[PDB]
Design a protein around this ligand. Structure first.
Ligand code: IUM
Ligand code: IUM
Ligand code: IUM
Ligand code: IUM
Ligand code: IUM
Length: 517
């Protein structure tokens, strides 16, 4: 943390943050969500980290170079250490990236190494080459070298993500699944795991071995698993919580803006809210059904009437303001909602649906007041505009992600937040073989478009290709885009260091501080 001159710090430097739900895990290779990454950033530190404004900056690597954007060499700081005092070395990175690549690890982010194009990743994921064949090597204890199969100019931007953070071989090997328990875990970020009570709290304490520990101000941070946005706001206003999670309750938002305007933080966020259709399950494997659902949803109503928190109506997966996005607004987005509804109704009629045999399916969402209200609104709009019936079903976050990976669903609410600020952070997740592809969408045309982007060595061709890839997804109605998120949350006046300028919201508690109050 960089405490401004003049600021008086509170005696007790402790923070309580709501985290939306119980995390899937504390193992960097077993996680896929925002709640999981929030805690991961404080415990595990990769090559690079985002600074307080979101810029890729030195993490364990103090400096790095590239040879033709294909061979990347990272010089690891000599004083990087694990919480047990053992040095963080390039070998920890080799082991970790190999474990992420290994099919036996079944990481939901195994494809992250495909996104970066590390050599031999495809064969490894396919079980054709051992994970030890991965294009990574430790040249010495402090030098990690990565070899890509093609030039990737934005490669280093990917490195702040939790999936490429190091894991301690020794604990993993000795305790297996239990390596993350407080008594077994070893971490290299600014914090260490103190306590972990499922469905109650996660308590982290400063890691004195952290290379930059002298600049860490908060001594303890608690992450809570409250999925009720109203409860999160209530516990924030009663004084228990210093930072709510970033899901704001429809019940109280407009009033909060009026009552505590200075605490209501609303900033740009590279995330898209959409309804994920299971593309491999009938009748969702019929583009007419998918298109109808996509068109009959009234984004203006949901965005301006139902949520009304500042989100923007969406017509694509990748947010148009992603660095490198130069998207074309589809024609249907310009039509009136009545025109969209007619088209929608006509398509389902063509698909064989009738009042006697209507389209009925499930709408799955992770337990939340905000998601439930949105799902109820969507159910009402689809019923009224298209004559479709939906059964709402809520599941706890960890279960919900598992259900989407299993494909045991019809339609699910969904949010995708960028991992790096470049369109492929989103587009890569729709690749037929992507480990993050819970839409179960497989398009050779789509795959081709993205493969070609690293075959051209100029940004305009790349941007055009991304625009075309979005058009392909839109033509196939792979998803139902709803809105581009705004990052809205409450932050007490005494919490310093949260700028709100990082569109990825990659917060590190080591950068915050408690002002005296
Ligand atoms: O690395 U360039 O356009
Ligand atoms: O630092 U560039 O094209
Ligand atoms: O900030 U730019 O490619
Ligand atoms: O309607 U149903 O899986
Ligand atoms: O607080 U209520 O749906």
């Amino acid at each position: 943390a960089d405490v401004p001159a003049g600021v008086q710090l509170a005696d007790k430097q402790t923070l309580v943050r709501n985290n939306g739900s119980e995390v899937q895990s504390l193992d960097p290779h077993k996680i896929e969500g925002v709640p999981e990454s929030n805690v991961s950033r404080d415990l595990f530190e990769g090559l690079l980290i985002s600074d307080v404004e979101g810029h890729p900056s030195p993490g364990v690597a103090e400096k790095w170079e590239n040879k033709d954007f294909k061979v990347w060499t990272f010089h690891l700081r000599e004083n990087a250490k694990w919480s047990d005092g053992t040095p963080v070395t390039a070998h920890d990175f080799v082991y970790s990236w190999q474990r992420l690549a290994d099919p036996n690890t079944a990481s939901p982010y195994a494809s992250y190494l495909q996104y970066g194009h590390i050599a031999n990743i495809d064969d490894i994921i396919a079980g054709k080459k051992p994970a030890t064949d991965l294009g990574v090597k430790a040249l010495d204890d402090h030098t990690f070298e990565v070899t890509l199969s093609e030039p990737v100019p934005y490669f280093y931007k990917l490195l702040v993500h939790p999936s490429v953070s190091p894991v301690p071989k020794s604990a993993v090997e000795k305790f297996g699944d239990k390596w993350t328990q407080p008594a077994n875990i070893v971490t290299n970020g600014a914090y260490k795991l103190k306590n972990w009570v499922v469905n109650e709290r996660i308590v982290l304490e400063r890691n004195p071995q952290y290379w930059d520990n002298a600049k860490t101000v908060i001594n303890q941070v608690t992450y809570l698993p409250i999925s009720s946005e109203v409860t999160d706001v209530n516990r924030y206003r009663s004084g228990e919580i210093d930072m709510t999670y970033n899901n704001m309750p429809i019940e109280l938002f407009q009033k909060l803006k009026k009552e505590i305007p200075n605490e209501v933080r609303v900033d740009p966020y590279l995330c898209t809210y959409y309804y994920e259709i299971n593309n491999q399950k009938a009748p969702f494997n019929d583009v007419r059904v998918r298109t109808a659902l996509k068109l009959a949803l009234d984004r203006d109503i949901i965005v301006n009437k139902v949520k009304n928190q500042g989100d923007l109506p969406a017509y694509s997966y990748t947010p148009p303001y992603t660095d490198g996005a130069k998207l074309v607004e589809p024609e249907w987005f310009k039509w009136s909602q009545q025109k969209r509804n007619e088209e929608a109704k006509k398509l389902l009629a063509e698909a064989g649906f009738t009042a006697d045999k209507p389209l009925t399916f499930d709408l799955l969402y992770n337990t939340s007041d905000l998601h439930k209200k949105l799902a109820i609104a969507v159910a009402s709009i689809w019923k009224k505009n298209l004559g479709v019936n939906v059964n709402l079903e809520n599941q706890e976050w960890k279960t919900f992600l598992d259900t989407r990976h299993q494909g045991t669903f019809d339609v699910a609410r969904a949010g995708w937040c960028a991992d790096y600020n470049e369109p492929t952070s989103f587009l890569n997740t729709m690749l037929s073989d992507s480990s993050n592809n819970t839409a179960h969408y497989k398009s050779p045309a789509f795959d081709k478009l993205i493969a070609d982007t690293l075959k051209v060595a100029d940004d305009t061709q790349r941007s055009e290709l991304y625009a075309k890839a979005e058009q392909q997804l839109d033509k196939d109605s792979a998803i139902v885009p709803v809105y581009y998120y705004v990052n809205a949350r409450l932050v007490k006046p005494w919490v310093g260091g949260y700028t709100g300028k990082d569109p990825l919201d990659n917060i590190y508690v080591k950068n915050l501080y408690i002002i005296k109050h």
